[PDB]
């Protein structure tokens, strides 16, 4: 049994998508099928619901109206219309076999996935910050320092450290993707307090999609 | 209609492991169909068990015997069940209830086939540097690294007072030595951050919390 | 206008500034009210695309003619048809059991052709939606001179300054509606606003028409031809529309599936609905942000005194679903042109206002005699008095909303 | 109309007390009215 989405990506508030699931290796005619979001770190979520036959559909409250599912048995489609679209469903929608048995039901089989992306913004250059200590904790005189970089749209940002002179106690995180649409980071570097007055210490930040290239004096 | 589940639960192999679900008093857990779905990182998730009674059930295909359900009426929760815990039982597992053509999902629980000696996080939290404030913005970085089952809680503190705007945390994420990482960010005005004497960076792991403050002074 | 509608939206405008957004929908209007400004109502009543363009056709509905079939026996070949490589014929070659009984030498497996003509009867057509090239059309409406006739009326309204009908496009978000006396108001809109039109299409079935994603209109298993006709067009995959069933040694029976109205119609079930009339007509949508600048719209009568004569209700204040009254009075003066008294009061003396009034600055125009005026009013809630006129013969009514 | 709970009243003093009480309002169009003067309590009724 295959479950394979299509038809998903990037789109922006408003407008719409078609997600489409091709079946095999089943019989497809006979067995209901749902639609399963999971946004990004987040749980699941139900969607929709369409019968083997098509007589019957059902849609969540956050999606009625302007979602609405169909269906093809002579092609072993599956599909899902989204109008409307907003911030919320921005997801990853699993195609999924919502079996009716005997008082028996459930989630037989999915497959992995299409992601949708609604966003606002078209493209953006981040900004980048020192992040100094001025405390001083003295612990083997261990001083931790860094640089954010603030407010980028295209994820990929390469963070270096003194031009690749800085390798040991490197430390770069994971981004956040914040409510404006952009995604923030930090980078932070742990050094002995010995080289607060002798090494320059600088961060070397470089967003390929935007063409910008920042060197701050962390 | 709510199922509520712990966010994570972590244990060593061997062990009975034990996962909750507990059922709005909408529901009555006795008479209703329990679906698990176990979702490894990478991977879709896959019907685990289907649960009703003891003498109503059905494995997913490819779960081992150790595998079990049951319920409990006075608190309407049910339960997930694993005899005999391997590192392979890692993942998340969800519950789900069908309930008048809603398909209800509980809030998932991350569970640790436990790996490491539990270890402490380490917390560092920076205050908006200078270049940022003459842009009229101020932005506090909280950084966690290196702890026990990606799992924490952050609370953002001022002046005493809990504050719940401008906030956002990463993920855990592993990271090289197959511990943990995450951030928070507190996103400010320069006069926001200039009215309250002292904030705070408030993160909880296993019911023990780390406490960092930082003063515009 | 945007009295009786029902997604009517009372969005207050800053007042002072000249600064207000509003998000205005298809079939829902919006009513702006500023400070010592003429309120306006504002609709948006038609998105057209002007641009179209036939990219494919498909036909859901066929006719079949000419049904023929020839069969050769085994070790003689392949079987053959004048009419196999025609265009507007279907065919469809097999392998049947043939030997004695058949009329044939050996026992073996004999080649069969069977084709028959294709027409197409009733055709569905997909065209081009042009991206950067879409069309609004918005219409205003003025408060205070206007009586509720004008809530539905279109036409004078060059001459009136009551009512002006704005165009937004594409390469042209800006515009400026002339409401003379009025003055003016600008408004800068087009959203850009990621319902990507570059990717969709305008399918037309039978007098039905619907908005339509390429990935799936590409992928519609019917018959079907590029470009528009110029005669005999040639379909492809006719295969779709007709079917051969049980070949029998020396023929093979051939059908036409029937129409595929049902089936489309089914399929696109939850898509974004449209028409078209006038060779131009389109789309049933809404979500237009704009943000308009009345510093160029004056009030018109403030110069007016107040109304001397006597009011008398040609309509009983009536609520509407918002909870704002709408008031019509006659007025049997000369003084007109001249402002209204009109207030609302808990009071009853002296004079103490209470609520606002929605057709700020009300006047009359027309001097002698018995001019009809209509005009609304936003009570508070509680229980207030409708006050129009001053002094004796003047009109009061009690009111009580929610 | 008609109140089939005959002398409503309140019994707690202090504060916010819960109470009940049934009405039987005329055919046609009519406003519940409970309260006094200023911050009264009304609601309209449609009954049949």
């Known amino acids: 049994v295959q479950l394979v989405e299509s038809g998903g990506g990037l789109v922006q508030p408003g407008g719409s998508l078609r997600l489409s699931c091709a079946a095999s290796?089943?019989?497809?005619?006979?067995?209901?099928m749902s639609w399963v979001r999971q946004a990004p770190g987040k749980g699941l979520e139900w969607v929709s619901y369409?019968?083997?036959?098509?007589?019957?559909?059902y849609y969540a409250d956050s999606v009625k109206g302007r979602f609405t599912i169909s269906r093809d048995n002579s092609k072993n489609t599956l599909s899902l219309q989204m109008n409307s679209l907003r911030g919320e469903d921005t997801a990853v929608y699993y195609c999924?076999?919502?079996?009716?048995?005997?008082?028996?039901?459930?989630?037989?089989?999915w497959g992995q996935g299409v992601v949708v992306t609604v966003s606002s913004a078209s493209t953006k250059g981040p900004s980048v910050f020192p992040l100094a200590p001025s405390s001083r904790s003295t612990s083997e005189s261990t001083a931790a320092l860094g640089c954010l970089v603030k407010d980028y749209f295209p994820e990929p940002v390469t963070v270096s450290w003194n031009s690749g002179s800085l390798t040991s106690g490197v430390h770069t995180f994971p981004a956040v993707l914040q409510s404006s649409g952009l995604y923030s980071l930090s980078s932070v570097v742990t050094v002995p307090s010995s080289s607060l007055g002798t090494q320059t210490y600088v961060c070397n930040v470089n967003h390929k999609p935007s063409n910008t290239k920042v060197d701050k004096r962390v | 209609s709510v199922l509520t589940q712990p966010p994570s639960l972590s244990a060593s192999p061997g062990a009975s492991a034990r996962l909750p679900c507990t059922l709005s008093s909408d529901l009555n857990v006795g008479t209703k169909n329990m679906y698990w779905y176990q979702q490894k990182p990478g991977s879709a998730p896959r019907l685990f068990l289907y649960?009703?009674?003891?003498?109503?059930?059905?494995?997913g295909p490819g779960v081992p015997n150790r595998v079990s359900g049951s319920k409990e009426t006075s608190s309407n929760t049910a339960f997930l069940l694993i005899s005999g815990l391997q590192p392979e039982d890692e993942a998340d597992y969800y519950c789900?209830?069908?309930?008048?053509?809603?398909?209800?999902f509980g809030g998932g629980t991350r569970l640790t086939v436990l790996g490491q000696p539990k270890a402490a996080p380490s917390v560092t939290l920076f205050p908006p540097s200078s270049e940022e404030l003459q842009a009229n913005k101020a932005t506090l970085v909280c950084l966690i690294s290196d702890f026990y089952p990606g799992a924490v809680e952050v609370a953002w503190k001022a002046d005493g007072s809990a504050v719940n705007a401008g906030v956002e945390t990463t993920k855990p994420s592993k990271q090289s030595n197959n511990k943990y990482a995450a951030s928070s960010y507190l996103s400010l005005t320069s006069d926001q951050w200039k009215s309250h004497k002292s904030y705070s960076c408030q993160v909880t792991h296993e019911g023990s919390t780390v406490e960092k403050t930082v003063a515009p002074a | 206008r945007c009295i009786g509608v029902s997604n009517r939206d009372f969005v207050e405008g800053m007042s002072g500034g000249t600064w207000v957004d509003v998000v205005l929908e298809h079939g829902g209007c919006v009513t702006v009210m500023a400070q010592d400004k003429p309120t306006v109502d504002i609709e948006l009543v038609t998105t057209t695309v002007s641009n179209m363009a036939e990219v494919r056709s498909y036909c859901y509905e066929a006719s079949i003619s000419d049904m023929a079939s020839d069969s050769r026996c085994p070790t003689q070949g392949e079987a053959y048809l004048d009419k196999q490589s025609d265009t507007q014929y279907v065919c469809k070659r097999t392998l049947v059991d043939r030997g004695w009984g058949n009329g044939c030498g050996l026992f073996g497996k004999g080649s069969l052709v069977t084709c028959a003509k294709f027409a197409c009867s009733k055709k569905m057509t997909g065209k081009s939606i042009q991206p950067e090239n879409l069309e609004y059309r918005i219409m205003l409406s003025v408060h205070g001179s206007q009586h509720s006739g004008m809530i539905v009326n279109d036409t004078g309204h060059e001459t009136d300054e009551n009512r002006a009908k704005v165009e937004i496009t594409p390469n042209s978000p800006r515009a400026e509606a002339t409401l003379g006396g009025f003055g003016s108001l600008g408004l800068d809109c087009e959203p850009r606003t990621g319902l990507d039109f570059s990717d969709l299409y305008y399918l037309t079935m039978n007098n039905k028409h619907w908005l339509v994603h390429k990935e799936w209109f590409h992928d519609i298993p019917l018959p079907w031809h590029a470009g528009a006709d110029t005669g005999t067009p040639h379909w492809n995959n006719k295969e779709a529309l007709v079917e051969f069933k049980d070949a029998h040694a020396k023929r093979q029976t051939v059908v036409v599936l029937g129409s595929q109205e049902g089936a489309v119609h089914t399929a696109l079930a939850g898509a974004l609905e449209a028409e078209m009339d006038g060779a131009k007509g389109r789309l049933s949508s809404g979500h237009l942000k704009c943000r308009l600048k009345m510093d160029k719209l004056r009030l018109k009568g403030v110069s007016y005194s107040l109304c001397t004569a006597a009011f008398t209700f040609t309509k009983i204040p009536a609520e509407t679903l918002h909870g704002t009254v709408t008031v019509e009075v006659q007025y049997a003066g000369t003084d007109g042109p001249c402002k209204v008294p009109a207030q609302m009061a808990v009071d009853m003396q002296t004079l103490t206002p209470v609520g606002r009034l929605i057709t700020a600055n009300p006047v009359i125009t027309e001097s002698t005699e018995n001019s009809k005026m209509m005009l609304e009013l936003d009570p508070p809630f509680g229980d207030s008095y409708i006050v129009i006129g001053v002094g004796e013969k003047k009109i009061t009514h009690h009111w009580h909303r929610s | 109309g008609r109140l089939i709970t005959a002398n409503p009243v309140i019994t707690e003093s202090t504060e916010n007390s819960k109470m009940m009480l049934e009405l039987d309002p005329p055919f046609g169009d009519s406003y519940i009215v409970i309260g006094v003067g200023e911050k009264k309590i009304t609601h309209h009724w449609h009954r049949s």
């Open positions: 369409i019968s083997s036959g098509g007589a019957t559909t």
């Open positions: 649960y009703y009674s003891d003498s109503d059930k059905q494995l």
């Open positions: 789900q209830v069908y309930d008048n053509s809603a398909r209800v």
């Open positions: 999924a076999k919502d079996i009716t048995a005997p008082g028996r039901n459930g989630l037989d089989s």
């Open positions: 290796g089943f019989t497809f005619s006979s067995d209901g």
